[PDB]
């Protein structure tokens, strides 16, 4: 009926989404076999009697991340055709994932996308997870998303991008990889949610109060944002939203769709009983700058649009109590031309907890996705990483030798120049 | 068949329960072989547990308390380090109420009788005697071993000695306390104990 088809491309996409799928299995009471001992329509099909196969595709050019799932505990859970492995790795090139090796996978992958979309009309959208600094995360991501825009006309496209850090990078080719992705991300996606890494390191340092978590604990918290995002489709609520309304909620101009995230509460099970989580307190932690999942300082940022999805046993008026005081506060600066800037939806069912996870059982939760002019910092910083490294044609021959035209890096920057100016033009 | 399949407790459990299942099925719609949910076992037999007064108590005494097994060795330095903090936690947590809250069983990875009694003199909680087969059966059940001596069936070591395992009525691993684990909260992991939702029913 109504559903969303999810795409996982690149390693970062796979193992974030592998956490995202194991959260969804236990949300609807689906065993790893795929059985259950009108909830599960929007992420699962039903096969024969008692089964639930997912609405997903795994794509990677290396086997090593995707085949390891094939032999994991989620053996029978995925149909063995949409798990796709190439032969050799993309190896941190935009060019290689876009020109040479990326071509021979899109020819089979788009077919499976067609095979999954032709059952029921009224597709909600496309949830594609990828990294940006990665090789296959950008190149295969671009080629798949470009083809999808032409083939399927008008339906929405959600894209969670594991954005390169302001501070750490864990690769040298990141400024060359990031810039080139953007020029092919602007006119394809509809809602690009920017996620960071050391923010969640900083989150798990303070709030979670666990000394040494790894990528497996990054992914739980990421999975908790996605569940609360699409909580409205799965379950009834006092005031629900859709995934086709977000683009009408958040974007004022078609080129401005780079939004942040926030989540609360994020508390250890040990320190949980020192906070009875009220609606008055969770909303203020949502707006507190050391709780957002992007790491950009919003003090130099004029807010433009905000979209809060409350979860669990929350009544509508203490939301209205909280938002009254929020607007009158002068630490959270809204822009002049947008005097209304809130959407606040509500769902009934409180968030699940993973067994052996790092999340205590909470009764209410807030998830925030906001459009702000602080992203001018995220981009003007990035442009500086480019031209300083492009000062004397560092690493150029790798891209040149793989297939790209030298000089295409210029209009990619001139594109990002325009995205730099319009944010600064808006904020005045 | 939790937390592993190939454990002596579970092989005894399966044998006994489906013996009973077939008998009553023939005597009578009942699903063979029985679900692990439907199976019932007696975990600690008649003469296993013995307390601080050297008196055997039955299993029904442990109802209403968060019980945890403690795999310990007398001569292991890590266990020698962990012992005072576990004792202090037992002290404070059980003193601070008008209700018994948690209880510890002692399972011995120790070498011999003398050293076992010497180490057991320090503990104010229950213990299982070392010559009792239940010690080795519990070791193989929860996959704790100091060295690859007893074969493991494609599994690994769950942990090393020392370890604290919060258990349930049926041999369910309720939660693992990360003393020497993937997390390494030495002496601090004891605060992770959720005693409210893990009561020995």
């Amino acid at each position: 009926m109504r559903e969303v088809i999810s795409i996982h491309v690149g390693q970062a996409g796979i193992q974030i989404g592998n956490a995202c799928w194991e959260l969804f299995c236990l949300e609807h009471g689906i065993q790893p076999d795929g059985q259950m001992p009108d909830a599960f329509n929007t992420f699962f099909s039903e096969t024969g009697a008692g089964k639930h196969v997912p609405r997903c595709v795994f794509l990677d050019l290396e086997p090593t991340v995707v085949d390891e799932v094939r032999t994991g505990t989620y053996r029978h859970l995925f149909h063995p055709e949409q798990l796709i492995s190439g032969k050799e790795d993309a190896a941190n090139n935009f060019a290689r994932g876009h020109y040479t090796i990326g071509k021979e996978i899109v020819d089979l992958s788009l077919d499976r996308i067609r095979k999954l979309a032709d059952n029921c009309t009224g597709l909600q959208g496309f949830l594609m997870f990828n990294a940006v600094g990665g090789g296959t995360g950008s190149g295969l991501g671009c080629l798949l998303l470009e083809r999808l825009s032409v083939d399927y006309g008008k339906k929405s496209k959600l894209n969670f991008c594991s954005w390169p850090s302001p501070q750490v990078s864990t690769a040298v080719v990141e400024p060359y990889n990031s810039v080139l992705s953007t020029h092919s991300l602007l006119e394809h996606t509809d809602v690009a949610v920017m996620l960071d890494n050391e923010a969640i390191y900083d989150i798990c340092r303070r709030n979670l109060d666990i000394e040494r978590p790894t990528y497996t604990n990054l992914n739980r918290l990421i999975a908790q944002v996605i569940s609360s995002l699409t909580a409205s489709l799965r379950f009834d609520g006092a005031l629900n939203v859709d995934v086709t309304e977000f683009q009408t909620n958040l974007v004022p101009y078609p080129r401005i769709h780079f939004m942040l995230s926030s989540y609360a509460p994020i508390i250890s099970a040990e320190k949980a009983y020192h906070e009875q989580l009220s609606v008055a307190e969770i909303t203020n932690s949502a707006f507190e700058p050391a709780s957002m999942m992007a790491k950009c300082d919003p003090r130099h940022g004029k807010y433009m649009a905000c979209c809060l999805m409350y979860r669990g046993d929350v009544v509508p008026k203490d939301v209205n109590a909280a938002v009254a005081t929020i607007k009158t506060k002068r630490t959270i600066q809204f822009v002049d031309w947008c005097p209304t800037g809130f959407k606040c939806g509500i769902n009934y069912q409180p968030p699940t907890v993973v067994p052996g996870g790092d999340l205590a059982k909470v009764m209410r939760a807030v998830c925030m996705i906001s459009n702000s002019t602080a992203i001018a910092e995220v981009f003007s910083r990035m442009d500086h990483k480019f031209d300083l490294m492009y000062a004397k044609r560092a690493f150029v021959h790798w891209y040149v030798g793989e297939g790209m035209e030298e000089g295409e890096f210029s209009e990619a920057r001139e594109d990002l120049a325009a995205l730099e100016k319009d944010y600064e033009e808006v904020g005045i | 068949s939790q937390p592993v399949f190939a454990s002596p407790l579970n092989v005894e459990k399966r044998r006994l329960n489906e013996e009973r299942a077939l008998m009553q099925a023939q005597k009578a719609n009942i699903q063979l072989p029985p679900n692990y949910g439907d199976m019932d076992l007696i975990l600690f037999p008649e003469g296993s547990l013995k307390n601080s007064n050297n008196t055997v108590i039955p299993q029904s005494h442990l109802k209403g308390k968060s019980v945890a097994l403690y795999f310990a060795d007398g001569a292991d330095p890590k266990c020698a380090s962990l012992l005072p903090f576990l004792l202090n936690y037992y002290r404070t947590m059980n003193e601070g109420g008008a209700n018994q809250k948690i209880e510890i069983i002692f399972v011995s990875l120790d070498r011999d009788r003398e050293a076992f009694e010497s180490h057991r003199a320090h503990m104010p909680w229950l213990s299982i005697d070392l010559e009792n087969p239940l010690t080795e059966i519990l070791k193989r059940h929860f996959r704790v071993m100091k060295e690859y001596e007893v074969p493991t069936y494609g599994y690994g070591s769950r942990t090393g000695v020392p370890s604290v395992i919060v258990i349930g009525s049926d041999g369910r691993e309720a939660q693992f306390l990360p003393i020497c684990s993937g997390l390494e909260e030495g002496d601090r992991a004891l605060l992770r104990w959720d005693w409210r939702n893990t009561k020995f029913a």
Binding site: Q31, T73, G356 | T152, G182
Partner: peptide, 22 residues
């Protein structure tokens, strides 16, 4: 010639058979 290696991946460790919601 080896006696067996018994450290285990984080993925295998923790995404295990949870008790199901109905």
């Amino acid at each position: 010639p080896t006696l067996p290696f018994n450290a285990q991946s984080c993925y295998r460790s923790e995404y295990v058979a949870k008790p199901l919601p109905p």
